[PDB]
């Protein structure tokens, strides 16, 4: 049972200062120690509890391993080969004129993201619009950029790592007191880059949805959390960012930043349902990272 409160502010609650009982190393006396969980980590019961306890038994990510996408080259054994299409305009389906053969693919960093494709291969010449069925509004529309879009993301909270030992051996990593100002995580997109790249895609959308058609964009229809937000990892933490400001446009037939609100969560159930939970350990200091927007994942609704 978590007895929790707000965070020292002076407003909108976002975080929780939680206290609980805890098994020490010995199977005898308990421990009165405190953590500090985001609102998405916990849930009340009519006093709180962790948001996973009523679903999946949980496991804590080891603090030595890094979730940093490294290049991965896939290969095939003997008696097999892999073909690489090498033309500049290919919607991934149909015959390829300039086919070349390779043994192992190019470095493919497994970037687990949603909505915004990150650190991917850049397209060639015109931006690419790839779909399984353009007439069906039930298949996602993969997009690949030619010019990358610059995105910055800070976690400007100088947080603390408390190590409460639930021994013998094992030890949980919590969040101590916060050193500095109460801010939240934000991703920046330059206003000048996102306007030219948005119009570059819609001239490609006119090639498929009528010449003099009107193309509009809105945020997520709703449903689950992962679908609506820009889920991604960087520095270990898991961000969940609001893209109502990147998809609020209406195009007809013919200097600052765009900051995006980002939440945060420690306990996660990745790839829909696999791997149980995972409480990624907290991260000290101000986390900052730059990523490349090299594509988008769009859906269509069921004139314009």
């Amino acid at each position, epitope marked *: 049972t978590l007895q929790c409160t707000n965070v*020292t*502010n*002076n407003m909108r609650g976002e975080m929780k200062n939680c206290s609980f009982n805890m098994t020490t190393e010995l199977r005898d006396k308990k421990q009165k120690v405190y953590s500090l969980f985001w609102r998405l980590d916990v849930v009340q019961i009519n006093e709180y509890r962790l948001i996973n306890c009523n679903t999946s038994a949980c496991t804590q990510a080891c603090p030595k391993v890094s979730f940093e996408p490294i290049p991965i080259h896939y290969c095939a054994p003997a008696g097999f080969a892999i073909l690489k299409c090498k033309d500049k305009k290919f919607n991934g389906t149909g015959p390829c004129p300039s086919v070349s053969t390779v043994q192992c693919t190019h470095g493919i960093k497994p970037v687990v993201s949603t909505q915004l494709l990150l650190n991917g291969s850049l397209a060639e010449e015109e931006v690419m619009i790839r779909s399984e069925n353009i007439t069906n509004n039930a298949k996602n529309i993969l997009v690949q950029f030619n010019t990358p879009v610059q995105i910055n993301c800070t976690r400007p909270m*100088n947080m603390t790592r408390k190590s409460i030992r639930i021994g013998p051996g094992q030890a949980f990593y919590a969040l101590g007191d916060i*050193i*500095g*100002d*109460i*801010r*939240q995580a*934000h991703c920046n997109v330059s206003k000048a880059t996102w306007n030219e790249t948005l119009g570059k895609v819609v001239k490609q959308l006119r090639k498929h949805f009528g010449n003099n058609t009107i193309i509009r964009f809105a945020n997520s229809s709703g449903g689950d959390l992962e679908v609506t937000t820009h889920s991604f990892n960087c520095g270990g933490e898991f961000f969940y960012c609001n893209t109502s400001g990147l998809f609020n446009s209406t195009w007809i037939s013919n200097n600052d930043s765009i*900051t995006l609100p980002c939440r945060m969560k420690q306990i996660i159930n990745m790839w829909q349902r696999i791997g149980q939970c995972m409480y990624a350990p907290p991260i000290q200091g101000v986390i900052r990272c730059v990523s490349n927007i090299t594509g988008l994942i769009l859906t269509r609704d069921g004139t314009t």
Partner: antibody
Amino acid sequence: QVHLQESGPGLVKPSETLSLTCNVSGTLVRDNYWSWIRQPLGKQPEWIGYVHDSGDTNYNPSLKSRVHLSLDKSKNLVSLRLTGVTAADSAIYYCATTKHGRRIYGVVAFKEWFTYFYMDVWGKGTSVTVSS
Amino acid sequence: TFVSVAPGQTARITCGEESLGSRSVIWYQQRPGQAPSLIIYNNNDRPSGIPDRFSGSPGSTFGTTATLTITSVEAGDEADYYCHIWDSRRPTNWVFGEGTTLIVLS
């Protein structure tokens, strides 16, 4: 030049209405903020509350249900009203101009800022003793 | 509290709790028998009429109090000093932090 002057009864019986007047000479009471501060003998200056035109006025959380300020735009003087006084409210009531500032520590757009006030031009002060 | 510094040296003045967020400390000078006057607002911004001998600790250090450094001490700066801790994690402070008194030796 800016000259401030507090005039008051000097003596008010317990559980009575203190009525203070701060005559202002050198500027108007509409373009500036205004603030009273009281200082017991030997204690630190305790803030009371700031007042300005356009309904922008706030009081100390400790003396809330008892104090009422006002700006006389026609007579160009600041008034104070402290209701239900005790021996605690005996102090020295100053009256000063107030300028404001905006401390920006975050990203501005996220309301990550707070307004701070500071008094620059004081008055001489009135002595208010409470005794029956 | 009190602070003693010889004529011509440097005085430093402690006031208020420790800093938990970014602050805007406001220092004041109360001469004996007079009204208090403004010395340093916005952590180290001096208004007109105050010399550059007075400097306050920057309101950007998390975990240090509000310090009022006073260089070239003179027999005139023998007066009281309060401050006004404006903190982002503290609600509005309406009582000034307890004062500090400067005493000029010799």
